Amino acid sequence: FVNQHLCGSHLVEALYLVCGERGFFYTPKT
Amino acid sequence: FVNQHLCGSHLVEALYLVCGERGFFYTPKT
Amino acid sequence: GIVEQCCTSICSLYQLENYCN
Amino acid sequence: GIVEQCCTSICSLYQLENYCN
Numbered sequence: 209f210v211n212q213h214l215c216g217s218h219l220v221e222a223l224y225l226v227c228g229e230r231g232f233f234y235t236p237k238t
Numbered sequence: 239f240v241n242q243h244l245c246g247s248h249l250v251e252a253l254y255l256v257c258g259e260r261g262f263f264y265t266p267k268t
Numbered sequence: 269g270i271v272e273q274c275c276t277s278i279c280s281l282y283q284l285e286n287y288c289n
Numbered sequence: 290g291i292v293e294q295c296c297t298s299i300c301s302l303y304q305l306e307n308y309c310n
Contacts, residue, residue, distance in 0.1 A: 210305055215296035220254045222295075224247055224264070226302065227309035231268075234254070234261040234308070235289055238290045240284055245275035252274075256281065257288035264287070265310055268269045 214222050223232040244252050253262040273283045294304045 210300055210302045212299060213296060214300045215292070217251065217254055219291065219295055219300070220250055221247065222300065222305060223308055224250045226305045229267060230309045231264040231266050232308050232310060233263040233289075235290060236261050236292045237259060237289075238261075240279055240281045242278060243275060244279045245271070249270065249274055249279070252279065252284060253287055256284045260288045262287050262289060263310075265269060266271045267310075 210222055210226065220234055223234060226232075240252055240256065250264055253264060256262075270283070270287055273279065291304070291308055294300065
């Protein structure tokens with residue numbers, strides 16, 4: 209699931225699954 | 239959608255929709 | 269943190285926006 | 290940023306993990 213174009217909620221979802229209990233930051237403007 | 243128990247992907251989703259172009263940080267351990 | 273305020277207790281817009289950049 | 294690397298170009302695990310805490 210990670211080796212594709214991922215945008216919006218699809219990108220958030222991938223971050224959520226990959227990062228797990230670490231959590232993540234989603235900075236689309238930076 | 240925000241005035242309920244939100245966990246896991248459901249919480250991420252709410253952050254995504256509320257924060258919009260600002261993005262957000264998801265820190266479940268902190 | 270966010271899990272305590274929004275998952276194991278009822279979330280709110282006020283609290284969610286504390287986690288926007 | 291993440292949008293350039295993963296949305297308007299093909300994402301990768303290496304890049305996604307740069308955004309884990």
